[PDB]
Amino acid sequence: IYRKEYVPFPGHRPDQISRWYSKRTVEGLPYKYLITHHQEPSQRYLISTYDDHYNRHNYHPGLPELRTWNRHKLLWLPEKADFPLLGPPTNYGLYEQL
Amino acid sequence: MREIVHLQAGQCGNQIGAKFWEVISDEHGIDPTGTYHGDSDLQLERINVYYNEATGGKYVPRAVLVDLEPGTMDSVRSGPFGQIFRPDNFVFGQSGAGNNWAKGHYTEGAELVDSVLDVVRKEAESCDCLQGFQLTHSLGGGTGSGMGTLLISKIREEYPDRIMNTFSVVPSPKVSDTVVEPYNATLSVHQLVENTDETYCIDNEALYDICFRTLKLTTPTYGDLNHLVSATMSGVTTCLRFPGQLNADLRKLAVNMVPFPRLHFFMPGFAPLTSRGSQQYRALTVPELTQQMFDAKNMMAACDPRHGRYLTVAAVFRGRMSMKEVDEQMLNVQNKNSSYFVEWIPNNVKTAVCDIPPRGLKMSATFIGNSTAIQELFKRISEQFTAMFRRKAFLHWYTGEGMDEMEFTEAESNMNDLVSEYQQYQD
Amino acid sequence: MREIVHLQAGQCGNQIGAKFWEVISDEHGIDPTGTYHGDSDLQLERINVYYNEATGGKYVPRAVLVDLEPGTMDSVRSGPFGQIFRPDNFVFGQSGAGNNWAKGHYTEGAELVDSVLDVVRKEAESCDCLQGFQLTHSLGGGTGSGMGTLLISKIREEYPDRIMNTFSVVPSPKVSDTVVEPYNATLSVHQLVENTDETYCIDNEALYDICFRTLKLTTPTYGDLNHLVSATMSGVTTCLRFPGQLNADLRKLAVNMVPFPRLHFFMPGFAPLTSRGSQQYRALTVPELTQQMFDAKNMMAACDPRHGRYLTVAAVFRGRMSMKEVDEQMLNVQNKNSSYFVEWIPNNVKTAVCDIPPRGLKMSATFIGNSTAIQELFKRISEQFTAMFRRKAFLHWYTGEGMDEMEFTEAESNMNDLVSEYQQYQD
Amino acid sequence: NLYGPRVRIGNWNEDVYLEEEIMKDFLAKRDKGQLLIQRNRRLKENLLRPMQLSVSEDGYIHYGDKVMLVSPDHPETEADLFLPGDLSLCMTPDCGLSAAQTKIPVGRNTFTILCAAGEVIGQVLRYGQNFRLGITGGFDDRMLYLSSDHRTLLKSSKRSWLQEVFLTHEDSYLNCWQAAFPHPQLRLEYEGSPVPANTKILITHCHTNRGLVAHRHLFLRTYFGQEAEVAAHTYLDSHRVEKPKNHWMLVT
Amino acid sequence: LPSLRRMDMDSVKACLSDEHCQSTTYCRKDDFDNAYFT
Amino acid sequence: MRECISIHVGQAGVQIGNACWELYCLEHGIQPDGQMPDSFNTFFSETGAGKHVPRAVFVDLEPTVVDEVRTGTYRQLFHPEQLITGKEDAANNYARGHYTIGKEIVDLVLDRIRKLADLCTGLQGFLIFHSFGGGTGSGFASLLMERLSVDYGKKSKLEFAIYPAPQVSTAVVEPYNSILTTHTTLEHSDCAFMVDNEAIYDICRRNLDIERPTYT
Amino acid sequence: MRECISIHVGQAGVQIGNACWELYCLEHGIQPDGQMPGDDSFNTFFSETGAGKHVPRAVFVDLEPTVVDEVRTGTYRQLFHPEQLITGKEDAANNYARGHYTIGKEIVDLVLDRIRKLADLCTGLQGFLIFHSFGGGTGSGFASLLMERLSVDYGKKSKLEFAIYPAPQVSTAVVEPYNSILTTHTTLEHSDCAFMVDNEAIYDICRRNLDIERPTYTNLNRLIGQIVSSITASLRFDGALNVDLTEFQTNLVPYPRIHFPLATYAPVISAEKAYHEQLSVAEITNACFEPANQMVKCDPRHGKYMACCMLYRGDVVPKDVNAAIATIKTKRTIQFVDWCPTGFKVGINYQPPTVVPGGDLAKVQRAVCMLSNTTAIAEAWARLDHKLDLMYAKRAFVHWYVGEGMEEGEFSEAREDLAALEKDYEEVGVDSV
């Protein structure tokens, strides 16, 4: 019985790839697919409030200088603290110094 | 500037910290090789809080990774940021703890502290002004619950005036993966209350409920829960590293939060979490973050706050934002439902605003809350303990390792009086 | 989200459903190996209604195949789609029935229904929202008419809110094939009256008339008769699986077609049927479909609706047509010969339109008719019953197993009052 | 009952959202051509480009011929694990050196015999005369060089702990090698003689006096798979003769 | 592929799952691999 | 300032709302995905991502038509959560959609309606698109009307309901529902404009030269 | 480096270890000649030489010179070390006394020496795996002597069992209650945990699950090897929740005399029916609790569960495991003791089970092995109680036992210890309030 049952099996390589899928499905989704909301860059919101309100003097070359009243939202819409120049990151030269 | 020393204990602590350091390196612009590829000087001024400056411009974290079995530490070293950690900070044994608090505190987890403590003294003596220590573990095991509490005790003995923080993943009520879990939880809470300044309670099934009912993921796994825990953890040290209009370090979140020294157990939360379907169709503002931050189903601990009462409340906001509606909204949430805030303290909400949000977000916020509903999480642990200890079930795996029968009674009495102490402040 | 569990009783039901799965597996583009290789992605929209998911993305039908002999199992495993069926669903006995309702219903039939229901209950409990049950069987036999009726009177109490669908082969008028088939037919339809929401009567002689006159097929094997039965078998559950302008599942065709719970015996009909020599001479217009479905030569039941009154009429259309032509045609065929519809019910026609025709047809239609012409089918079975029963002939093969005269008298009384209430509600 | 990723059952809309947006990210990465399959394919095709070694019209190798550094097959069994044989020196992007089981000029195998002193190209290489070995880098015509340094507590070989060999862009005397006759009593006679091209010779670092050695029992698992490790150590027998593993051949 | 009646014939004889048509077939794995339809 | 919230109930309501919101997106500068390359505020509300989400709630018990909307050409315009969907059908029964199957989805549609009113400041109208002959539009619309009259009060709700026609008829149990929902709604609404499909068939085939019109 | 040494005692031991090491060699890339042509940590069960030859760290010991010797002339004759196959000239011949007192002490020196030569190469030796049978002479006598010597020589270390309990009503011998009870008398004080399997329960699950009739002993050794491989799977491969040999011991037995958990394997499906089923975690867990799919012929509804050590395998997700357990805990037909509120242990492994060609299982993607100790095993001890009660009043088969070293008075001590064990099992399964 032993020499009939326990016969060598040629060309039987093991499964070494489904365990990769099982490890990767428990690693989890990266941070892009779980917490990043409006497909947003890693360069946008890096502006200090001091650096926006004193260093650049509320620059933002796209707001009207006089606010205007709307018919639907009953407020004078263009809020200079609500659209705070999501633009050039705050640099002062520490990168080149280091 | 005020440096923070990170400690990781156990499989859960190691994986949470592995997922945490990648978020920190993302928000400070550190690549997996350790070099800097960000684009702002705000990410480089206070990078010394978490990273030391090695030669050649590479940054190595100030973290110590402690375990007793090398299985999960191989996966940590095969993490996406696995090469940034110092090889000398990897301290690990060859024999497991066997889900045993007793042998992981006295027999197998006490001869390895002579190297862990040497490492901790080494990397906390190069920092200029050390603020405190940071520990993540799980109370339901044998490595984090056993060895981690001994580490906490010795660190508090050697550094008495620093801040000891703890993100403990307590055993979940409904689903469990260890029979001797209540013994470890009971024996760990008693040593927690004697040597910690702050302790955050995270329940795994509350995290699963958050992933199922808000993120709407069909297959939520441990990596997503680790991301949520790490996103909460990075939101409490944001004023250390980035500027803001109202700063608050870890000590400001203590003095404003613990009135009585035995009441330092909180339940954390993260505001901007939504599914991929509704992620494009919502607007990030103040009244959207504060509406669901105070929501009962957005908490990382499985305790309903509508049962209990909020003792004092913290909310640390991030990103460029206004200071009026961050006060108006958290005055209105205090005055509409005034029955869930205790009355012997007039204001209860602490406000902190940073102006640099997490990457991929416009603004975000972190919730720290001390409530009288956290004692629900200890009453059922004590009920399971007194259901198990009265029959001496699984007790020879604790008694024969060098522990007396009175330690269980002392720990259970201490937790029972902790439970009864929270009961005084509800009615 | 709706699912159907399909049951197969006896030789006739086994062959009919083995052909039905042949006509469903190509509608949904499913290979004989189980793989999906269809044309469009609309076919996988609602594959859940008839198919489960196996490992590797294969699809297996949700069918239960029962009999008391393994011969028909050998026939259906040797067919084209034999290897797609579930091997655990082949429940068979060791000894056959052989045209006895008593042994197929009480002793040998009841020795197998436990093993049948141990699969049926598991399949129903695995369903998320099961909507109904489907049965293919023959009333003129012994294993279908007994064990299928026992299954009907065993799943009805377990799931009392679901839909019972039956595909019954009633004995033909001109030529019979079993001398004890009046007995089994009467007992089977006596069980069928009180445990089924709707029955679909099919006669083989009417199918011979269709296959000889309409299709000009002068050697009509049982394959083409199974084609004809199975086409209207799939044309009634089409709005579940494919979108359309006006949808109708089995419950919608229930409320509009059975007014009174004992009057739920219908007659089917499939509209586009043309010979190969009359193919190019027939225009493909919706009027021609309405003409062919509303003639009495396209009825699978051997009953002329000239005598009786159509109580309510169903008509489900497939393909792309405007609703105006369908509405105009059906309103005007109601209005022209308005003496063949009951005036107590104001409008009698039910309309449903689906957007996917069968693979190869420009458009299609399917007739379901409640009429006062089915009771004529029951009259002649009653006359044969009283002729056979007043002489007590062929009766000792029944009372030797558990029957008595009381069940026969009760069944004859039930058919007498069913004929009486069919007659009462025509005029 | 759980179904598959094409049928609307249960939660399907969120999986469609995630699948479509992951598809969009992957398609953007594909259009930009920065997928790691594409980067790996380009790096592999740069590494395996067909090069043409120069023929020797007189049987000698001169300065400036594109040559090979192959290791002859040895029947000796010092250790019972072994790489089969006919190993050629190759550059491995771990810059990295390894002996590889191939014998076709593949671009990461071809070396150019350079000059150290004032020697013009076409001048015949000689025994005991300094020369440098150069290879082409990735996406640039900047000459790397075969170089070795003294063995410290910080700079040694990878799996053995002997003297290292790397590729570098720095020009010094760490850059130089010289060829020696394998026969020890016939070394000083065979000094001014020209080198026959495909002959078993010994290559020594001029600043450390350590010959190049390809350790056949130390397997390096790379993307191509199962290559040896090369270091700089002069092994000897009991008869004061170098090992077969120290010998090297120059293939034209 | 084996018929049910053949399975019962093979069950009547005392075949020890190595002569049975249950666990043994003459087709090799290449016969199963190329047994598709498209 | 004059925002309106449309409630489409049933297969008729969803198929009407598809054409209605196609016309609304065409009238303003709204792309089919919701982008715009300021009169739209009465129908469309802006978010922070630049999208113009509609102020509409699509409900049906039977999932097929809402599923078709989810996989149609207007997938990126609508919110994933304004499309409220059950599992079982309505089965042409007022009783089911008003008492058994209609009272386990009323919480989510009411929460979405309350959620919609938060972004708006000047709400004064509710538009109801449903049919008197079906089960959803007769049963579930009626109970939603009762709850809306309970928790909002004096906001005017107007209904565009598809009435039975004298000659054409889709269903048989249609007079039962057509009497029952007009008995329930009659005190809980403000103005009810009636429509029947045979009239628009006549209008299309006479006033235009169009032959065999469809539902769209 | 966390290796385990296997010890196979007796004919049952070697015939189980053949299938076990065949599956171990098949699940890695190990040829039968010991040659190999990331996370594959085969060093916990295979040593290494200079030529890449991997030898098992196991000993095959049996007093009969047939079955171990026929291993030496088969397929795997080049795999095992020649000196790790200890065989004897005269067998015990169904005699606990003979293999415990006359043949035992005389051959135990070589087995102890070979274990010591295997153990000095170890670095992080976790425990010992002992395979034997209760009804035999070698597997009851020489196994218990090995227990005694291993415990006095290594002390506090794990010692796990895969023992063949006697079937309740069917048997191959007649003196087997004597041997079984005598070896349980000396096992309780010197064992750590004893995973229990039968033969006729495996006969029933071979008849009704794989749809085969007439199985042989290899046809059961395949299932036993599958159980052994899945139990030690978390020590050779990685996983989300790894479980070592110490977790079987510190999370399953509440008292040091309750160390008998029942074993079962969930997806026992044949290759003609495997690919038509959806083998998800819910139906792979519900089938593991069924009263017909256990390896010990005993109904767990008779008793109360103490602890359950679920080991999972394959492409399993922990949320499905938690949902399946929460489904189990809502079933009132299945009970737990009151002093165990949680009552579960979960281990997750990534590697799906490798299939053996010529076997009877299929290429499944998921697997569950359970180890649960239940008060219902007291029903199994009562039958052996009654059988020794029947056979000892007449002093049948005693003259064989007393002529080989032992006296009459040790049957009394074995009887007292089994009565005490029945008392403990009865006392545990009561309430507190």
Ligand SMILES: Nc1nc2c(ncn2[C@@H]2O[C@H](COP(=O)(O)OP(=O)(O)OP(=O)(O)O)[C@@H](O)[C@H]2O)c(=O)[nH]1
């Ligand atoms: N004018 C017009 N009428 C429609 C349209 N769609 C459906 N109808 C009418 O709707 C009636 C039946 O549909 P429903 O009211 O939705 O019936 P239901 O049971 O609720 O169907 P579901 O909503 O799918 O559950 C028919 O009598 C049609 O007259 C449409 O697109 N245009």
Ligand SMILES: Nc1nc2c(ncn2[C@@H]2O[C@H](COP(=O)(O)OP(=O)(O)OP(=O)(O)O)[C@@H](O)[C@H]2O)c(=O)[nH]1
């Ligand atoms: N299920 C199963 N049972 C086995 C197997 N091999 C042996 N057994 C059982 O184990 C019992 C003990 O028999 P042996 O192992 O031969 O006894 P022994 O260890 O050789 O001791 P001696 O017979 O005295 O030499 C037998 O009665 C069999 O019932 C096996 O492969 N599978």
Ligand SMILES: Nc1nc2c(ncn2[C@@H]2O[C@H](COP(=O)(O)OP(=O)(O)O)[C@@H](O)[C@H]2O)c(=O)[nH]1
């Ligand atoms: N949220 C979360 N839970 C984890 C993680 N790893 C383990 N756990 C949970 O922690 C519980 C026990 O952890 P355990 O294995 O005992 O950690 P140990 O103390 O290092 O042994 C298990 O029920 C797991 O579900 C993780 O990375 N994240």
Ligand SMILES: Nc1nc2c(ncn2[C@@H]2O[C@H](COP(=O)(O)OP(=O)(O)O)[C@@H](O)[C@H]2O)c(=O)[nH]1
């Ligand atoms: N249309 C059709 N009728 C069938 C088929 N098979 C059997 N029948 C009918 O079934 C009747 C005999 O019933 P039978 O199957 O022998 O009885 P049973 O075996 O007890 O279910 C005959 O009148 C046939 O007309 C089939 O494939 N198609």
Ligand SMILES: [Mg+2]
């Ligand atoms: Mg619908």
Ligand SMILES: [Mg+2]
């Ligand atoms: Mg023997």
